[PDB]
Amino acid sequence: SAISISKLQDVLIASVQVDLTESTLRDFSLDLLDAVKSTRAKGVMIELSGVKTLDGESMHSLLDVVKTVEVMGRRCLLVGLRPGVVIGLMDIGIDLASTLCVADLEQGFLYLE
């Protein structure tokens, strides 16, 4: 499959290239991340939403939540398409405050860890 992701230090670098219509690809990414977690054993994890053409996947939000929790690991998001992403995201609402817009979409929380 085309999707791939690499990590600096113990810091994971998940990357949203586009809205992945495939929640199955969402499942695939979840699997890759859990596999990575098992092998690498590293702690920091990050995800970049360059854009999320589609929003309201409560299931995808759930994927985001599980990824923070199972990882028991660091978790940040680069907000993309916020104007249309957040309004949909806001319509969805949120019950968590762990992650935030990545401070420099990398440089900010890389520094932060």
Partner: protein, 125 residues
């Protein structure tokens, strides 16, 4: 023209020296206009990513019912971007009308006027 004059108002009430941000506005306002403001904050945030931002409602013109909704959803939204949003100015009966709504979710950060807001910011700074 008065609409565009209104639109003229929100962007300045957002920008501040040192990347600090805020948003004073009139309390009795259109809901669609509030969605506009919602859109404005998103673009503003892109324009200059700012972790610092505030909702200022000093002397809210009228405590409209749906208007809370906006700031209800809106406040949650700064945190949703990961942005910080604070309430620095407001009226008290405006607040009572709010609490009387039985509102319960709010647990965000606020301040006393643009004075204590900046003090905190220059401390987050």
């Amino acid at each position: 023209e008065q609409s565009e004059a209104l639109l003229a108002m929100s962007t300045p009430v957002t920008m501040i020296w040192q990347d600090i941000l805020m948003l004073p506005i009139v309390g009795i306002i259109d809901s669609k206009r509030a969605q506009d403001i919602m859109s404005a904050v998103l673009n503003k945030i892109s324009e200059n990513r700012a972790k610092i931002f505030i909702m200022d409602i000093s002397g809210v013109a009228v405590v409209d019912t749906a208007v809370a909704n906006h700031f209800i959803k809106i406040t949650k939204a700064t945190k949703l971007m990961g942005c910080d949003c604070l309430v620095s100015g407001v009226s008290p009966s405006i607040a009572r009308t709010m609490v009387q709504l039985g509102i319960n979710v709010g647990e965000v950060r606020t301040n006393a006027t643009l004075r204590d807001a900046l003090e905190n910011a220059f401390k987050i700074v």
